[PDB]
Amino acid sequence: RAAEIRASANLAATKMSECVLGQSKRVDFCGKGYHLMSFPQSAPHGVVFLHVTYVPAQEKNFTTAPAICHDGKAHFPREGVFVSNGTHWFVTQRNFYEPQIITTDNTFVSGNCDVVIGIVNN
Amino acid sequence: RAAEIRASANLAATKMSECVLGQSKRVDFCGKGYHLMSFPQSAPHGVVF
Amino acid sequence: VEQDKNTQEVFAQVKQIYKTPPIKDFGGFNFSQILPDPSKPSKRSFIEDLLFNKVTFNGLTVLPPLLTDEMIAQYTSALLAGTITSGWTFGAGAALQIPFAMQMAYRFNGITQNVLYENQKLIANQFNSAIGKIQDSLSSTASALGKLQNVVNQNAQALNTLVKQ
Amino acid sequence: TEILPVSMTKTSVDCTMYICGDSTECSNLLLQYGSFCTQLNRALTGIA
Amino acid sequence: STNLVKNKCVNFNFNGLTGTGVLTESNKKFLPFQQFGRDIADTTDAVRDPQTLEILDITPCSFGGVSVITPGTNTSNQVAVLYQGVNCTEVPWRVYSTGSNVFQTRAGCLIGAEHVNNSYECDIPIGAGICASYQSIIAYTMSLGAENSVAYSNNSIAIPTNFTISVT
């Protein structure tokens, strides 16, 4: 039990200590998500841990595009993805939606639009 | 053996848990480089990573 | 009960049996044995079949696992299904789809995407034949399973010396 | 700077010399404990 | 001496060797110099009887532990009983054993419970993949969850607009 206690105590040492000093991505540690913090309280032989578990959620079935040609050249983007929410087309992110104008600042160019199947013209 | 297998299970729970579901900087525990995912299997009493 | 707790801990990591849709279309990717074959009633991969074959009273009862082996097989099929279609974001968020082909570009750009739409076959076939080589190596090479054999042989000899006592 | 053991000295035990000191009468009485020191030495070789 | 009976749990005194179990017909091959058998660690696994000189084999008659499935004395008072690892024909509680329904598991047999076709996130484990509950006792096939399929394509998305923060 003490080795179990010590394994749990090293777990406990790992959990409250680091579970506060920085973002720590290991699961079963502090949060099933992008870890940021935790808050412990004592108890007669042990501790309590509420975990910070940020979750993106409530998914749908919207649309996105593989690539967009512009003036004969194909675009494969660094950040700013081709998506659509139904009506208007924007450049956005991995996890959510935040539009930007397609510019040379937020888009990078790679290859011509004549070989890849499923390309859309713009 | 129950302590070691549960130490192995705590390892085993962790290997599938913290070695697939995101890209952290974990190395030399699960994986041997820029780790990206892993693909387990059953066994009689074990796992394959 | 802690072995039952052990098995549920190591195997029930996600909340439902997620599945990829049975069509396999990313851009020419081959990994026929990492998603198991639902035409087989076993719902397991081939390596598991060889795994099952390869390994070899006065009250020393065996109580069967609650998570019995077909459910263990159904669990691990989900755990194969969990990570190969839905990426790295469901431990950040919901198990929601985002395309795997541009996931291969970002799963590359952390290590730009001109290489993937032009060389989709090449970037794929690196992993494909290499996992193909090792899965053939898993199928062909025996004696790679010391530890479970060490656990079972020690425990069987633990049982055997226990009954030898 | 932190300091942490990583092994110990690898030790093994002759069952019958340590428990008898090379005595036939002692070892004969010792054999009726069955498989008694195979598991100790297995554990210690396992330790080894 | 008396007469010998096979495939029923009896107690036997074979030439001073006292033991318990179910005797049946053995496809093994005793040589004539053999007197009896054992297999591993001094348990007599087969015996040839001292008179008719025919081979029987012995397994001590099937048994296990008994477990009770009761959902709490505040919620109800009815039980289910598990017998661990027996085909539930060689049991001879006679008020329960004859009754409405008796069910048989790969880990033995269940008394006072009926199999259902359902699927539930089960709570009280039985063994062999079946588990029991009060819901009168049901035992069934546990569900891992709903089986659902996150569908991929290169040209579709699923955009969260809210979050589900869970704090445990």
From Swiss-Prot, chain E:
<feature type="glycosylation site" description="N-linked (GlcNAc...) (complex) asparagine; by host">
    <location>
        <position position="87"/>
    </location>
</feature>
<feature type="glycosylation site" description="N-linked (GlcNAc...) (hybrid) asparagine; by host">
    <location>
        <position position="162"/>
    </location>
</feature>
<feature type="disulfide bond">
    <location>
        <begin position="9"/>
        <end position="61"/>
    </location>
</feature>
<feature type="glycosylation site" description="N-linked (GlcNAc...) (complex) asparagine; by host">
    <location>
        <position position="117"/>
    </location>
</feature>
<feature type="glycosylation site" description="N-linked (GlcNAc...) (high mannose) asparagine; by host">
    <location>
        <position position="154"/>
    </location>
</feature>
<feature type="glycosylation site" description="N-linked (GlcNAc...) (hybrid) asparagine; by host">
    <location>
        <position position="74"/>
    </location>
</feature>
<comment type="subunit">
    <text>Binds to host ACE2. RBD also interacts with the N-linked glycan on 'Asn-90' of ACE2. Cleavage of S generates a polybasic C-terminal sequence on S1 that binds to host Neuropilin-1 (NRP1) and Neuropilin-2 (NRP2) receptors. Interacts with host integrin alpha-5/beta-1 (ITGA5:ITGB1) and with ACE2 in complex with integrin alpha-5/beta-1 (ITGA5:ITGB1). May interact via cytoplasmic c-terminus with M protein. May interact (via N-terminus) with host bilirubin and biliverdin, thereby preventing antibody binding to the SARS-CoV-2 spike NTD via an allosteric mechanism.</text>
</comment>
<comment type="function">
    <text>Attaches the virion to the cell membrane by interacting with host receptor, initiating the infection. The major receptor is host ACE2. When S2/S2' has been cleaved, binding to the receptor triggers direct fusion at the cell membrane. When S2/S2' has not been cleaved, binding to the receptor results in internalization of the virus by endocytosis using host TFRC and GRM2 and leading to fusion of the virion membrane with the host endosomal membrane. Alternatively, may use NRP1/NRP2 and integrin as entry receptors.</text>
</comment>
<protein>
    <recommendedName>
        <fullName>Spike protein S1</fullName>
    </recommendedName>
</protein>
<feature type="disulfide bond">
    <location>
        <begin position="122"/>
        <end position="131"/>
    </location>
</feature>
<feature type="disulfide bond">
    <location>
        <begin position="88"/>
        <end position="109"/>
    </location>
</feature>
